[PDB]
Amino acid sequence: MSAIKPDMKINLRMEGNVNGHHFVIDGDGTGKPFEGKQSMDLEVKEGGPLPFAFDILTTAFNRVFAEYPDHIQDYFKQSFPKGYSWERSLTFEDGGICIARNDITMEGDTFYNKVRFHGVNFPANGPVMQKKTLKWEPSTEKMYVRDGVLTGDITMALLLEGNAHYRCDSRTTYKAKEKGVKLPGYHLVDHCIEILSHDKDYNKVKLYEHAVAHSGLPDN
Amino acid sequence: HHMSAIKPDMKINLRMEGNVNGHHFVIDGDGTGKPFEGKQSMDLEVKEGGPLPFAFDILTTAFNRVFAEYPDHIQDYFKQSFPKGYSWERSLTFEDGGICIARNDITMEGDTFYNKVRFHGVNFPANGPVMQKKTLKWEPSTEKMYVRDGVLTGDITMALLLEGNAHYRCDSRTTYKAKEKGVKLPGYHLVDHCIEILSHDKDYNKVKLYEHAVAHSGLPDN
Amino acid sequence: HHMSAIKPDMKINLRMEGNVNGHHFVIDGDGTGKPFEGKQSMDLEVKEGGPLPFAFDILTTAFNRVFAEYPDHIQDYFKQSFPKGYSWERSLTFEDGGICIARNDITMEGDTFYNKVRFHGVNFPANGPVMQKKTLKWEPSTEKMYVRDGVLTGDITMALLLEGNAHYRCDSRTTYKAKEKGVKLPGYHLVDHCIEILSHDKDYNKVKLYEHAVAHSGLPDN
Amino acid sequence: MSAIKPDMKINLRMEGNVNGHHFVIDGDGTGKPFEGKQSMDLEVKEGGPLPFAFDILTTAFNRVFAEYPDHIQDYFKQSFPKGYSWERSLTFEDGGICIARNDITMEGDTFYNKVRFHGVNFPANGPVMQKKTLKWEPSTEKMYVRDGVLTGDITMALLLEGNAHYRCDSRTTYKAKEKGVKLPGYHLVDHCIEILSHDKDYNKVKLYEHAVAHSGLPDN
């Protein structure tokens, strides 16, 4: 009767505004929570074609999808059926700043995601507005508790055309809806996110992520 | 060049929608101002989301650099942006991790500015001065104005005074963009600010706000 | 207060040693100044490591807030710190990753201030404005003075003017500590600064530097 | 085609100044470069007992000692016998900022390390001046090239007494002495550093580190 099933569906609606450009994006996917793997088909419903690199949105498209070993507390699987929410800031090295929120609920075998994304101050000659990005590099999220709230800090980098990189700092706070969800100790979550396929304007994107929790060296 | 259509006495009309730490709110504003004196006041009314669960002070600079006294030797991007108007986007990075972004579309009709304002903030700690409403006021500040990536940009070291005389630092970056073509870009300059909540009811559902701003070139001709 | 053994005209003696991007240097300075006017000037000479391979400008704020005009309504922590003296520590964080720290231990014998200065910088990119010497000057600035955990702290939004009238941003954080126990701390206030190189030889082995600084309470006051 | 041996000696000399406190610390250790392991006995020679937390110094006490797999360029082992140097900034969340430098050379089977360390603006009641730190948590360094120089950024955290964490951002730049050493692609270096033993005043410290380079998920 556990709330997390081996094979679950993801329903998602994101609405947002980057540099004044409004958009709405729907997502429909599937995933294996215990293997930390998920995939989603995304469709721009409003605001297509997007004038900014689709990659800035992709980590906003659920830490339920992370394989947690036994010795690390799994805050996110413990947050269901009721669910949890997160808030995030993305601080890019050229001054562009985004904030995002996701309210996550569950019914039967399906997670529901109410997503908001806002970005300001991206320069017109920067790699985001020039759509010069190729992918997020693999990353490692550092998970710790601060003021009673599980917090994830990430040194991220977008690979650009030309083999340069473009740095972004992520800070996420995760909050279970129900009281009594046990907070975890310090730990790390490896991430790899990839756009598997897209049409020319990125009005249709298939996205994939793999995530694994561990305790660092030497144990993991 | 360009003539302004800015008048010595103008009206201000403002609607803000936003969301801080997940709480939705809508706030309306109606005020007057003296553009060439750089002074303005506004009556604010929380329409949705009252009583606000966070310190009202974090919103107040989102509540127009038209209201800044510019001397003749510094180009005035803002008065030269009308009648068509301009927009700005802003990040507020607080020292305890709280981050806000805001934007304002400013138009003009007759003697009235219209402001379409959006405000979103995340990651404010539950026991911090913002969610505990321990702020007292913004200290007077100086905005540093310069052209970055072809765009007029204002960077400000800001500080909220807290109860128990302590300060809570916030870093501000704003980009300003005229709607019309051909607006001349200024050289580097400073804008002194002082913003004040003159009065408010107990829950800050109603707030009277005041700002005074003066542009200058720094020492010694300050 | 006015019980100062600070005189209206003071000599300034300085030795800086440092290392930027692996390059060692020693620089001596001899100047004079008017503490109550907030003005000072200095002749600087590179004794070792000349000609410097980085922009001289990054060094110049390390070349004493005694030379700041304080009005009577603001507590003057720096003039009150003498005759014993005070020390400061500083970080300079540049927008392209270059970071500097600096310290100065300031003493006084007779009519002369003595300055033991150290300056270390790391992580300047090979083709950035510092290592390529594209800086023209510091822009005028305003330092924001406040108390944090018992120590007077000054935060500054600084900008180096570059070739082509672009700007290169640096964030300054300084902590100031009187040697004597019990020197009274000021409330929040603002110090305008304008630092300028008045002349130099081609390689900047010899530089004449000037600074004007004035404390104030911001608008609508000063 | 070697230069670097499976077992190598380490000689270190650090001079520095934190909060105005001058200090000199000597190091003598051994390590296995191809296994990414090293141990060092440290001894304060001037400025002891230190008035600040010893932990802030320990990552300044050589990425030679990192296990690099065959599919990733090993910039550090390729830098010898000539050597290389690094510069680092540490930015703590409460305003304390450190810079450090190390000039690494090699004479026979021994590495030599000329280390400098300077720290400023640590609050008198912060965990560093109050010596309230317990250890660095395991970390992951993100390694990428920027303006021709191999750069590593780290989200780091000190565990404190009282079940709390104290966050520090590290940026290091690494420069081979010899011209033309091949730069690597983007990659990640897991770290775990540990004070194994120490006397009461931390005037003698036994330090240990384990480091392993990898390409992130799923390649690890």
CA nearest to B44, candidates B198, B209, B201? B209
Contact present, A30 and A8 (Cβ < 8 Å) = yes
Tell me the C-alpha distance between A211 and A67, whole Å.
Answer: 6
Expressed in Å, this structure's resolution amounts to: 1.9
Residue B222 structure tokens: 């300050």
- H/E segment holding residue A139: strand A139-146
Pairing type for strands D164-176 and D187-198 reads unpaired
Question: How close A22 gets to chain D, by Cα (Å)?
Answer: 33
Task: Chain C: list its partners (3+ Cβ pairs within 8 Å).
Answer: B, D
Q: Which chain A residues are closer than 8 Å to D220 by Cβ?
A: 190
DSSP bridge pairs for A18: A21, A119
Interface residue of D67, D140, D151, D196 to substitute, partner A, most A CBs within 10 Å: D140
Question: How close C173 gets to chain D, by Cα (Å)?
Answer: 8
Contacts of D175 (CB under 8 A, 6+ apart): D84, D85, D86, D149, D150
Q: With b meaning 16 or more CB within 10 Å and e meaning fewer, what string describes B22-53? A: eeebebebebebebbebbbbbbbebeebeebe
The CA R_g of chain C, rounded to the nearest whole Å, is 17
Residue C37 structure tokens: 């006017």
Contact present, B97 and B123 (Cβ < 8 Å) = yes
Experimental method: X-ray
- H/E segment holding residue C79: helix C77-80
Question: How close D125 gets to chain C, by Cα (Å)?
Answer: 7
Q: Which chain B residues are closer than 8 Å to A149 by Cβ?
A: 125-126
DSSP state of B133: T
- Per the CB < 8 Å rule, is D157 touching A164? no
Question: How close B12 gets to chain C, by Cα (Å)?
Answer: 22
Q: Which chain D residues are closer than 8 Å to A157 by Cβ?
A: 142, 144, 186
What is residue C51's three-state secondary structure?
A: coil
Q: With b meaning 16 or more CB within 10 Å and e meaning fewer, what string describes C186-214? A: bebbbbbbbbebeeeeeebbebebbbbbb
Q: With b meaning 16 or more CB within 10 Å and e meaning fewer, what string describes C90-116? A: bbbbbbbbbbbbbbbebbbeeeebbbe
Contact present, B20 and B121 (Cβ < 8 Å) = yes
CA nearest to C210, candidates C201, C197, C199? C197
CA nearest to D122, candidates C175, C197, B121, C11? C175
Prior bond to D33 cis, omega within 30?
Answer: no
Contact present, D32 and D38 (Cβ < 8 Å) = yes
Tell me the C-alpha distance between B138 and B161, whole Å.
Answer: 6
Hey, what amino acid is at B14? L
Tell me the C-alpha distance between C207 and A148, whole Å.
Answer: 54
Question: How close A12 gets to chain B, by Cα (Å)?
Answer: 18
DSSP bridge pairs for D208: D39, D194
Q: Which chain C residues are closer than 8 Å to D15 by Cβ?
A: none
Residue C83 structure tokens: 């005759």
Hey, what amino acid is at A79? S
Residues of A in CB contact (< 8 Å) with B are: 17, 19-20, 85, 87-89, 91, 95, 97-101, 103, 116, 118-121, 123-126, 146-149, 171, 173
- Structural domains of chain B, with CATH: 1-222 (2.40.155.10)
Residue A137 structure tokens: 């590099």
Contact present, C194 and C209 (Cβ < 8 Å) = no
Handedness of CA A44, A49, A51, A52 (dihedral sign): positive
DSSP state of A67: B
**How many residues does this entry show for chain A?**
220
Pairing type for strands C167-178 and C151-162 reads antiparallel
Contact present, D167 and D155 (Cβ < 8 Å) = yes
CA atoms within 13 A on the CB side of B156: 25
- Per the CB < 8 Å rule, is D165 touching A157? no
Interface residue of B39, B74, B144 to substitute, partner C, most C CBs within 10 Å: B144
Task: Chain B: list its partners (3+ Cβ pairs within 8 Å).
Answer: A, C
Hey, what amino acid is at B7? K
CA nearest to D138, candidates A150, A183, A192, A214? A214
Handedness of CA C133, C135, C136, C141 (dihedral sign): negative
**Block residue for tokens 């807290």:** B162
Contacts of D89 (CB under 8 A, 6+ apart): C97, C99, C122, C123, D97, D98, D99, D170, D171
Contact present, C116 and C28 (Cβ < 8 Å) = no
Nearest chain C residue to B149 by CA: give it: C166
C-alpha distance from residue D189 to each of A66, B61, D182 (Å): 21, 43, 18
Contact present, D198 and D205 (Cβ < 8 Å) = yes
Q: Which chain A residues are closer than 8 Å to B103 by Cβ?
A: 17, 20, 120
Smallest Cβ distance to D217: which of A146, A155, A212?
Answer: A212
- Per the CB < 8 Å rule, is C140 touching B218? yes
CA nearest to B81, candidates B183, B150, B154? B183
Count of CB atoms within 10 A of residue D163's CB?
Answer: 10
Residue B204 structure tokens: 């800050």
